[PDB]
């Protein structure tokens, strides 16, 4: 029994491995904000930016020049905001150059047609900005309001 | 209140995960499963 097959077309340079496209990776990649069926841009970008802004307040808050200082969480928030702004500028100029239709693979047989235009990628960039700012500020608020929150004591004792 | 048992911080993470996070995930996923057409 060949569990590693092609995608239906063998001469295309890809293989349908269990990791690539079997049953659980076709879903949860087609159900991510990118490649989900019903979402518009400025909603895909909102979800992606919220997740990214939330995760990126982890190596700036406890890993920085100010991490031994009470200004450390605020400096990590400002650094996350700056990185999200730089990434939004990158997304905006990537769209402003001109985008093509995204690459269709075995995992994603249908790519979002709304991201194939410059106007869709501008909405994605704006949603990424608002989401990144919101996620970074939400992670800052969650890390700052108990003022110790000993989950942050974990992975800062590691990153001493 | 943290306990005297080993890894007392794990009730502070798993109990809100199993009581709030993954039931929300399971109801969202099962809602999308039972309400999708075709």
């Amino acid at each position: 029994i060949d569990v590693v097959n092609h995608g239906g077309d063998p001469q295309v340079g890809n293989l349908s491995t269990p990791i690539n496209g079997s049953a659980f990776t076709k879903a949860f990649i087609n159900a991510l904000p990118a490649y989900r069926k019903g979402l518009s841009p400025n909603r895909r970008g909102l979800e992606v930016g919220m997740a990214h802004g939330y995760l990126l307040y982890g190596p700036f808050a406890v890993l920085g020049p100010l991490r031994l200082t009470e200004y450390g969480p605020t400096a990590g928030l400002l650094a996350t905001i700056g990185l999200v702004s730089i990434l939004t500028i990158c997304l905006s100029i990537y769209g402003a150059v001109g985008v093509s239709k995204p690459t269709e693979t075995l995992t994603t047989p249908e790519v979002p047609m709304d991201l194939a235009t410059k106007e869709g990628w501008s909405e994605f960039a704006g949603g990424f900005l608002l989401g990144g700012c919101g996620g970074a500020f939400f992670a800052f608020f969650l890390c700052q309001t108990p003022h110790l929150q000993p989950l942050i004591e974990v992975a800062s004792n590691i990153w001493s | 209140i943290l306990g005297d048992f080993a890894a007392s911080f794990l009730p502070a993470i798993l109990v809100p995960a199993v009581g709030l996070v993954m039931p929300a995930v399971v109801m969202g996923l099962l809602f999308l499963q039972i309400e999708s057409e075709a």
Partner: peptide, 30 residues
């Protein structure tokens, strides 16, 4: 009492029936 590392060892051991329960449930669906 048991150690702190033994709890994390038992958790990553418990991921082995965690994965296999997901694998049985999808094949029981089919």
């Amino acid at each position: 009492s048991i150690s702190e590392t033994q709890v994390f060892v038992a958790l990553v051991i418990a991921l082995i029936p965690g994965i296999l329960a997901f694998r049985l449930a999808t094949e029981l669906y089919k």
